[PDB]
Design an enzyme around this catalytic site. Structure first.
Site, PDB file in Angstrom:
ATOM      1  N   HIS A 366      -8.873 -31.104 -24.225  1.00 46.61           N
ATOM      2  CA  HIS A 366      -7.730 -31.027 -25.123  1.00 46.61           C
ATOM      3  C   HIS A 366      -7.051 -32.351 -25.363  1.00 46.61           C
ATOM      4  O   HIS A 366      -6.115 -32.342 -26.161  1.00 46.61           O
ATOM      5  CB  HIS A 366      -6.672 -30.041 -24.579  1.00 46.61           C
ATOM      6  CG  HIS A 366      -6.998 -28.570 -24.736  1.00 46.61           C
ATOM      7  ND1 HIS A 366      -6.529 -27.875 -25.825  1.00 46.61           N
ATOM      8  CD2 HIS A 366      -7.710 -27.638 -24.008  1.00 46.61           C
ATOM      9  CE1 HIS A 366      -6.914 -26.605 -25.804  1.00 46.61           C
ATOM     10  NE2 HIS A 366      -7.633 -26.439 -24.706  1.00 46.61           N
ATOM     11  N   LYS A 557       8.351 -31.122 -31.122  1.00 48.69           N
ATOM     12  CA  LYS A 557       7.157 -31.181 -30.265  1.00 48.69           C
ATOM     13  C   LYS A 557       7.556 -31.897 -28.965  1.00 48.69           C
ATOM     14  O   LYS A 557       8.640 -32.478 -28.977  1.00 48.69           O
ATOM     15  CB  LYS A 557       6.028 -31.991 -30.908  1.00 48.69           C
ATOM     16  CG  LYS A 557       6.452 -33.419 -31.337  1.00 48.69           C
ATOM     17  CD  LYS A 557       5.468 -34.113 -32.245  1.00 48.69           C
ATOM     18  CE  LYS A 557       5.096 -33.338 -33.488  1.00 48.69           C
ATOM     19  NZ  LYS A 557       3.604 -33.365 -33.584  1.00 48.69           N
ATOM     20  N   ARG A 558       6.783 -31.946 -27.887  1.00 49.92           N
ATOM     21  CA  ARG A 558       7.220 -32.531 -26.619  1.00 49.92           C
ATOM     22  C   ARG A 558       7.523 -34.000 -26.851  1.00 49.92           C
ATOM     23  O   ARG A 558       6.901 -34.606 -27.715  1.00 49.92           O
ATOM     24  CB  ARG A 558       6.127 -32.401 -25.445  1.00 49.92           C
ATOM     25  CG  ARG A 558       4.840 -33.351 -25.377  1.00 49.92           C
ATOM     26  CD  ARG A 558       3.532 -32.928 -24.594  1.00 49.92           C
ATOM     27  NE  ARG A 558       2.322 -33.755 -24.815  1.00 49.92           N
ATOM     28  CZ  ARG A 558       1.068 -33.446 -24.380  1.00 49.92           C
ATOM     29  NH1 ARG A 558       0.820 -32.420 -23.591  1.00 49.92           N
ATOM     30  NH2 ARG A 558      -0.006 -34.203 -24.597  1.00 49.92           N
ATOM     31  N   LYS A 563       3.570 -39.596 -29.259  1.00 52.89           N
ATOM     32  CA  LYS A 563       3.973 -38.755 -30.390  1.00 52.89           C
ATOM     33  C   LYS A 563       4.969 -39.475 -31.294  1.00 52.89           C
ATOM     34  O   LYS A 563       5.255 -39.052 -32.422  1.00 52.89           O
ATOM     35  CB  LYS A 563       4.545 -37.458 -29.822  1.00 52.89           C
ATOM     36  CG  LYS A 563       3.466 -36.421 -29.594  1.00 52.89           C
ATOM     37  CD  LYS A 563       3.946 -35.381 -28.599  1.00 52.89           C
ATOM     38  CE  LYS A 563       2.881 -34.332 -28.374  1.00 52.89           C
ATOM     39  NZ  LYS A 563       2.712 -33.465 -29.562  1.00 52.89           N
ATOM     40  N   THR A 665      -1.071 -28.641 -33.571  1.00 53.51           N
ATOM     41  CA  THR A 665      -1.096 -27.274 -34.086  1.00 53.51           C
ATOM     42  C   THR A 665       0.262 -27.123 -34.779  1.00 53.51           C
ATOM     43  O   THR A 665       0.334 -26.456 -35.833  1.00 53.51           O
ATOM     44  CB  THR A 665      -1.279 -26.253 -32.946  1.00 53.51           C
ATOM     45  OG1 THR A 665      -0.370 -26.569 -31.882  1.00 53.51           O
ATOM     46  CG2 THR A 665      -2.709 -26.279 -32.391  1.00 53.51           C
ATOM     47  N   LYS A 669       1.305 -25.420 -38.608  1.00 49.83           N
ATOM     48  CA  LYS A 669       2.282 -24.376 -38.832  1.00 49.83           C
ATOM     49  C   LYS A 669       3.184 -24.738 -40.004  1.00 49.83           C
ATOM     50  O   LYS A 669       3.604 -23.861 -40.767  1.00 49.83           O
ATOM     51  CB  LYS A 669       3.088 -24.174 -37.557  1.00 49.83           C
ATOM     52  CG  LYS A 669       2.203 -23.888 -36.357  1.00 49.83           C
ATOM     53  CD  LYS A 669       3.078 -23.810 -35.109  1.00 49.83           C
ATOM     54  CE  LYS A 669       2.273 -23.719 -33.821  1.00 49.83           C
ATOM     55  NZ  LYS A 669       3.275 -24.187 -32.873  1.00 49.83           N
TER      56      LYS A 669
HETATM   57  C1  PLP Z   1       2.954 -25.099 -31.945  1.00 44.38           C
HETATM   58  C2  PLP Z   1       3.901 -25.480 -30.838  1.00 44.38           C
HETATM   59  C3  PLP Z   1       3.689 -26.672 -30.190  1.00 44.38           C
HETATM   60  C4  PLP Z   1       2.530 -27.606 -30.648  1.00 44.38           C
HETATM   61  O1  PLP Z   1       3.102 -28.725 -31.321  1.00 44.38           O
HETATM   62  P1  PLP Z   1       2.322 -30.038 -31.670  1.00 44.38           P
HETATM   63  O2  PLP Z   1       3.191 -30.662 -32.639  1.00 44.38           O
HETATM   64  O3  PLP Z   1       0.981 -29.677 -32.081  1.00 44.38           O
HETATM   65  O4  PLP Z   1       2.286 -30.941 -30.403  1.00 44.38           O
HETATM   66  C5  PLP Z   1       4.531 -27.065 -29.164  1.00 44.38           C
HETATM   67  N1  PLP Z   1       5.574 -26.268 -28.809  1.00 44.38           N
HETATM   68  C6  PLP Z   1       5.795 -25.092 -29.477  1.00 44.38           C
HETATM   69  C7  PLP Z   1       7.079 -24.352 -29.238  1.00 44.38           C
HETATM   70  C8  PLP Z   1       4.969 -24.687 -30.484  1.00 44.38           C
HETATM   71  O5  PLP Z   1       5.315 -23.566 -31.227  1.00 44.38           O
HETATM   72  O1  NTZ Z   2      -5.574 -28.378 -28.225  1.00 47.17           O
HETATM   73  C1  NTZ Z   2      -4.233 -27.922 -28.042  1.00 47.17           C
HETATM   74  C2  NTZ Z   2      -3.270 -29.086 -27.964  1.00 47.17           C
HETATM   75  C3  NTZ Z   2      -3.606 -30.219 -28.973  1.00 47.17           C
HETATM   76  O2  NTZ Z   2      -3.342 -29.752 -30.299  1.00 47.17           O
HETATM   77  C4  NTZ Z   2      -2.810 -31.481 -28.685  1.00 47.17           C
HETATM   78  O3  NTZ Z   2      -3.194 -32.475 -29.645  1.00 47.17           O
HETATM   79  C5  NTZ Z   2      -3.139 -32.066 -27.281  1.00 47.17           C
HETATM   80  O4  NTZ Z   2      -2.193 -33.084 -26.937  1.00 47.17           O
HETATM   81  C6  NTZ Z   2      -3.192 -30.958 -26.264  1.00 47.17           C
HETATM   82  N1  NTZ Z   2      -3.201 -31.158 -24.895  1.00 47.17           N
HETATM   83  N2  NTZ Z   2      -3.289 -29.883 -24.367  1.00 47.17           N
HETATM   84  N3  NTZ Z   2      -3.328 -28.965 -25.422  1.00 47.17           N
HETATM   85  N4  NTZ Z   2      -3.266 -29.628 -26.640  1.00 47.17           N
END
Ligand code: PLP
Ligand code: NTZ
Ligand code: PLP
Ligand code: NTZ
Lengths: 831, 831
Positions: A366, A557-558, A563, A665, A669
């Site tokens: 990942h 996002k985190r 990022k 992801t 969205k």
């Molecule tokens: C989808 C989702 C993420 C994934 O975010 P990325 O921008 O892909 O790192 C993280 N936290 C929550 C609450 C989500 O719904």
């Molecule tokens: O694949 C699911 C998501 C990716 O979308 C992120 O880019 C990546 O930082 C990650 N690390 N653990 N899970 N993930």
């Protein structure tokens, strides 16, 4: 009519009301005169759960009768979110419960906000798992998600003085209506102990035992009547050696010390990925692996074997009846553990057990950033798990013999691709154990999968190129479209129908309304309504009146350096410096919303959160800025806040240094819900731009070739500091205390990092970013042209459905065919 | 017809079956093809619980409408036992559920043996509380039993090599269908902290907070439709200072450390009464006192005041609306705590708060033996509870000023009756705090109450003689007659009716069938059937074929030296020595059954258990003894084993040194069920003999005057060793290893104790005991004469109904009138 959010049948609203009142009285032991919203929420939760037990029971009996190959998805994370509305949606129950509760005088939307989030995840990893489970049930697959039932989920974030304050997430205080504790299937997990070699077999003897009690949660497929199972294990002390070896202690204290074996599922480790070598972590890892594998073999011993034909416990057919997906290296121990159960307890030859193990197991990678890789100390596996570190040595030994036979004389290859890293602390590379022992390895986006073949797993690829694959991440249309954005799902539904929720590729038919003034007014009407609700909610349950007429610019996002939320901050300060410079010049107005949680020990992430609130402090009280700019930090971002922000956004920020975000992801969205993306060529952003055309994206910055070229010559931020006066201004505004007046020195660590140790090159993407930002404000000024670029994004989201991802996993890794045809609905029968 | 164990109505068996299947499917999420006995037990448990929620809800609303005085019974113990059959019995539901489940093909009696015992008690104390709650509901009283919900009840006893082995009682592994968690009413309990004196009031500030979450269990009255509440508190960590004071620690570990505040209700302290000065104990004590008093005041602030008339929060009417019963000194802190809430938070004058506190509070003393008295270290109350030790000093100060005003110059009185004991460790005498602060103090039998006035609380009696009272213990006829002995309840019912279950005094009408050959054959027929079932069960689920034609001689109760199980052992060895001496002489055959648990640290009790199994070892394998004598140790005596043994016994052993057993309640359970008593003039044995006449008892041994006379001259066991050759023989059989052949030295500690430090004078009651035992074997030989002495015991049990005890408490201490008239049964309405 509301939407076509299911039918609201006459008999069906009657039966729901009756059942709601039967649970308020009998289940809640309340009467409507003493019942809060909370008690009303639980009476609806139990009435909706009633409607899926019939299906859950019929779906499981069904998998036993026709004995399909079963898929066990092992993840130490499932970020499920709230499950009431998702259950009503996948059962066609939402306007019936909405009529029904309204007739009881209840606003169903009040009751839904009562539910705690199952936040058993940190973020992209646990949510990918949550989204895959919804698709597996929707694609008719005999699949079980297997995780740990954490008592404490991801901490609740409090911003207290601009600083994140962590709080324990006690998501079970009020109970969970959705699980069914299954005490009857408690299983033993062995820890510590030693290995004695009989000249017949090896026995792992002298172990401490922890009991694993399963808890099942139903996962309902969209309107196909399949209800599959998420089994989550809970740790329990044996109430026997705990009170069988006495030999001084004290009775009370032998009973207190049980919350010490029960601690293994006490809490989710808060590392929005980075790796921490803690024993509790390896223990949680081994716990879900050993308990689950006992359930897999159990269900394999029974079936059309524990019944008939070629009468030995035929483990040869194990890979044709079983597939386990390792979601990252967190369950990697499923590989020496399936070898243990096979070789030690079933007594198969080593070589035959290995053929069965690799044919069963598959590994998903990942991320490529090295601080996230699990490399366990050998003195740790030797103490805690000694048979597995012995089996792992045996795997490593026979692997290098085949590497050495293929690349003769390549002594460096061997050092490189070893599962045992020598060094200061000898360690085991779990990623390497997963490629050795899986028949498929995969990345989560086409750029990431390639980078795996070209850098990190290059030697493994040269040996076994046939293993590496790509399965580009996806998002489920149900929660992330039908659930959070009923309005948008409705106007699409009006034009092209409702079949698009089982194949989002039908959204391609929307391209035909790009030039349709009704549809352009409708797509922009619902985005303006969503923005009116999120503006409202924000005042109501949090803070300041934001302008719904602003461009809602959001990065949720985190908080990590890769990022690049500090790159978004540099842009915000740039905007504020241009307004101040030329105060009476029109700018397109923005409400910048940045939000996400920081792992507790990542000091820089915590410093970044303080920056953003410190920029909000300044900008939001500048009278000259007025209303043209606001900076908001969205406190406690979690799945349910994502269902609120993402339908209300106009601009999605996906700004990772190229090569670092494996997929993302969040980005998908936001493409489904009518926001345009400003982003680097990173992760799935590459396939998103490609799906809608570059001209419909605001792609920018360095590409991955450019980060390598820059790294080979040497990245020096000072050079950007010299050539760009607006970047000079900002840096000196940070250093001198403009944004931290009582403590001038406060952001000194961030300045210093940017200036001297930026691993993610924030300064090199600054000019291309702030210019690319001028082009999106430019487009925003032309409403009709924004809404049609938007219609070309929405229309092209189909590839990003987790239903596509899962029919790809099923077919190219698991050897299963996805069906989506309704199973019979039980209606009466209790068997 | 079965019995008249309720009606088994046609519509009513239909509705039960339907409801049983609705919970197997919907609640258990099973189908009859995958469901065990256990799942069947839980489907019946939930169908029976459904039938009392309507009543529970109507009973509580009712107490709010007509606002009666409420009684809060504070006990750190409630030994409830299994509750399915008690609920069916108090609702008239037992032959309906029995028809119904039979028609589903289920033996209801299998399903009842599935239920764990709520063993939240150790023995006589917790069971008296359990028995009082059943009577309070039966007497229509607005009463609430208030206790701690222990996670681990009293340990499960394992006899492993003749030695007791303790095991944790995880009674909740499978859940409890009977409680309703009430998270909504979590309350804060403050611990540690300090007192700062504002010149306005005292504030207790800087405290650690623990949350108390209530769990309610319904207590159904016998067929009067009253369902009252047992509220049990569970400890919960605040998910705030635990994560609000950080200042180094580590996030994970701040979350692990919560099972440290939750430890306060982790386990019941196993001291079948003796006192252990542990901090966890004072904490459990303060926890149930502070949480409960918040609920009392809450319910008092509302009512016909938090509504109308003389508009200040009138605490003057508090004693007329509130009565709290302190069941031993375990809740004694309810006295400085009600002063704290009144003086510190309600700001009443000290003197006015004290008038309200003594008018509310009443104290029950349960034993006179000094090792059971709570005397808390002052450095402990100063650290943990500093405002309460300050308030307690203030109580002590004003008490001695009134003692000194009444007995001028009596400096020794003052030292004697102080709440603060000076000495090595300065301490607080909790018994003394309870007599100072209660308006009634009471003993549990007439001999005990007198002994309190004559020795231990003599000075307090001389000051305030008006406070001391007696309330002789009782047993509930429902579980201890109708439930465990349906047969006996049926033949009594045939002759005199069923009204005797609400007033056991109607058993006096049975005296008329003492000379009735049908009734003498019936009373002896059911005792022979009960003895056939307990003989069966014992082989089936434990061990050896015992002779149902033996006299079942049983002593079941906690192992203590004062209860004198070693005296019963001396008698058993005596019997075995007479058989061996004269092998071919007829003796009446006995099966001696001794059972009970030993507190873990009481080494002598553990040694006594090993003696009894060591005597079983010898006697039961002597071929010459054949079958005339068997010694059985009943493993893990608890309430549900008591419902099995006590209906099957012919002889009840109640052999305590006179003056030590305050009352006993086991003794009364055996008188109701047709066993004759061999016992000393101790506790309620005195009132039992008196109720049936001495001639119908086998009363014997020293009386209390005789133990004092013996103690004044000096008790010397050697003298008995000289004059009695059968006691010589036994002692030397112990010392040399006859009963412990591989370890001759093994019983050396018991010999030595008997011989040199017997505080309970075992040897002085030996000749009178073994002779009195010759008279019961003598009577046993004359079946018709045994059964009629038995009919004169049974017939005279009415005084020993806890319904009499409670109408005495209600009337002479609480100022409440007992009603027993049916409240309306809800039938349809959910409010
Ligand atoms: C989808 C989702 C993420 C994934 O975010 P990325 O921008 O892909 O790192 C993280 N936290 C929550 C609450 C989500 O719904
Ligand atoms: O694949 C699911 C998501 C990716 O979308 C992120 O880019 C990546 O930082 C990650 N690390 N653990 N899970 N993930
Ligand atoms: C009644 C009862 C007791 C009380 O016994 P005594 O002989 O009065 O000490 C103790 N334990 C249990 C299981 C009981 O049922
Ligand atoms: O009053 C209830 C019972 C009495 O019957 C016992 O005689 C006495 O030892 C005791 N100690 N605590 N509780 N109890």
């Amino acid at each position: 009519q509301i939407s076509v959010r299911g039918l609201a049948g006459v008999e069906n609203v009657t039966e729901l009301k009756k059942n709601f009142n039967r649970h308020l009285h009998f289940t809640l032991v309340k009467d409507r005169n003493v019942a809060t919203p909370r008690d009303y929420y639980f009476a609806l939760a139990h009435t909706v759960r009633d409607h899926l037990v019939g299906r859950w029971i019929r779906t499981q009996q069904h998998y036993y009768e026709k004995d399909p190959k079963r898929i066990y998805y092992l993840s130490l994370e499932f970020y499920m979110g709230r499950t009431l509305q998702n259950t009503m949606v996948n059962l066609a129950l939402e306007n019936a419960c909405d009529e029904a509760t309204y007739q009881l005088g209840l606003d169903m939307e009040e009751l839904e906000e009562i539910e705690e989030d199952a936040g058993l995840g940190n973020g992209g990893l646990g949510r990918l798992a949550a989204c895959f489970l919804d698709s597996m049930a929707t694609l008719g697959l005999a699949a079980y998600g297997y995780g740990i039932r954490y008592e404490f989920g991801i901490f609740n974030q409090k911003i207290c003085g601009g600083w994140q304050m962590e709080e324990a997430d006690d998501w079970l205080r009020y109970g969970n209506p959705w699980e069914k504790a299954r005490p009857e299937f408690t299983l033993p997990v062995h820890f510590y102990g030693r290995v004695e070699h009989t000249s017949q077999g090896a026995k792992w003897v002298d172990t401490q035992v922890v009991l694993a009690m399963p808890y099942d949660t139903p996962v309902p497929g969209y309107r196909n009547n399949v209800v599959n199972t998420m089994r989550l294990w809970s740790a329990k002390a044996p109430n026997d050696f705990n009170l069988k070896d006495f030999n001084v202690g004290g009775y009370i204290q032998a009973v207190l010390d049980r919350n010490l074996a029960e601690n293994i599922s006490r809490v989710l480790y808060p590392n929005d990925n980075f790796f921490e070598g803690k024993e509790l972590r390896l223990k949680q890892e081994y716990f879900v692996v050993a308990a689950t594998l006992q359930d897999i073999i159990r269900r394999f011993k029974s079936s059309k074997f524990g019944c008939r034909d070629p009468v030995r416990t035929n483990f040869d057919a194990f890979p044709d009846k079983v597939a386990i997906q390792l979601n990252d290296t967190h369950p990697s121990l499923a590989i020496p553990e399936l070898m243990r159960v096979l070789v030690d307890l079933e007594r198969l030859d080593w070589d035959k057990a290995w053929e069965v193990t690799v044919k069963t197991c598959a590994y998903t990678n990942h991320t490529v950033i090295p601080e996230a890789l699990e490399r366990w100390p050998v003195h740790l596996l030797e103490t805690l798990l000694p048979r597995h570190l012995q089996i792992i040595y045996e795997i490593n030994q026979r692997f290098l013999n085949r590497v050495a036979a293929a690349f003769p004389g390549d002594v460096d290859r061997l050092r490189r691709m070893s599962l045992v890293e020598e060094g200061a602390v000898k360690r085991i590379n779990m990623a390497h154990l997963c490629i050795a022992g899986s028949h498929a390895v995969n990345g989560v986006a086409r750029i990431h999968s390639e980078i795996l073949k070209k850098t990190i797993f290059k030697d493994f690829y040269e040996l076994e190129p046939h293993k590496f694959q790509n399965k580009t991440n996806g998002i489920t249309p149900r929660r992330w479209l039908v659930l959070c954005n009923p309005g948008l799902a409705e106007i699409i539904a009006e034009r092209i129908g409702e079949e698009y929720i089982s194949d989002l590729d039908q959204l391609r038919k929307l391209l035909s309304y790009v030039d349709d003034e009704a549809f352009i007014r409708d797509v922009a009407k619902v985005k303006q309504e969503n923005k009116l609700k999120f503006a409202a909610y924000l005042e109501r349950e949090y803070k300041v009146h934001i302008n719904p007429n602003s461009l809602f610019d959001v990065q949720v996002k985190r908080i990590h350096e890769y990022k690049r939320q500090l790159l978004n901050c540099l842009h915000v300060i740039t905007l504020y410096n241009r307004i101040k410079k030329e105060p009476n010049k029109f700018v397109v107005p923005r409400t910048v919303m940045i939000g996400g949680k920081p792992a507790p020990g990542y000091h820089m992430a915590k410093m970044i959160i303080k920056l953003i609130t410190a920029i909000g402090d300044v900008v939001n009280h500048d009278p000259v800025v007025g209303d043209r700019l606001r900076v908001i930090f969205l406190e406690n971002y979690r799945v349910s806040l994502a269902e609120k922000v993402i339908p209300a956004a106009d601009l999605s920020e996906q700004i990772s240094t190229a090569g670092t975000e494996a997929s993302g992801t969040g980005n998908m969205k936001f493409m489904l819900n009518g926001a345009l993306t400003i982003g680097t060529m990173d992760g799935a952003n590459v396939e998103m731009a490609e799906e809608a055309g570059e001209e419909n994206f605001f792609i920018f910055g360095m590409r991955v070739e450019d980060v390598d070229r820059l790294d080979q010559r040497g990245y020096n931020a000072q050079e950007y500091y010299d050539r760009i006066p607006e970047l000079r201004q900002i840096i000196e505004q940070l250093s001198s205390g403009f944004f931290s007046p009582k403590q001038p020195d406060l952001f000194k660590d961030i300045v210093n990092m940017l200036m001297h140790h930026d691993r993610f090159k924030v300064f090199a993407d600054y000019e291309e970013y702030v210019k690319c930002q001028e082009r999106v404000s430019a487009l925003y000024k032309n409403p009709r042209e924004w809404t049609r670029m938007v219609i070309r994004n929405i229309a092209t989201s189909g590839k990003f459905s987790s239903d596509r991802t899962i029919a790809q996993y099923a077919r190219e890794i698991w050897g299963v065919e996805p069906s989506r045809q309704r199973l019979p609905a039980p209606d009466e029968k209790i068997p």
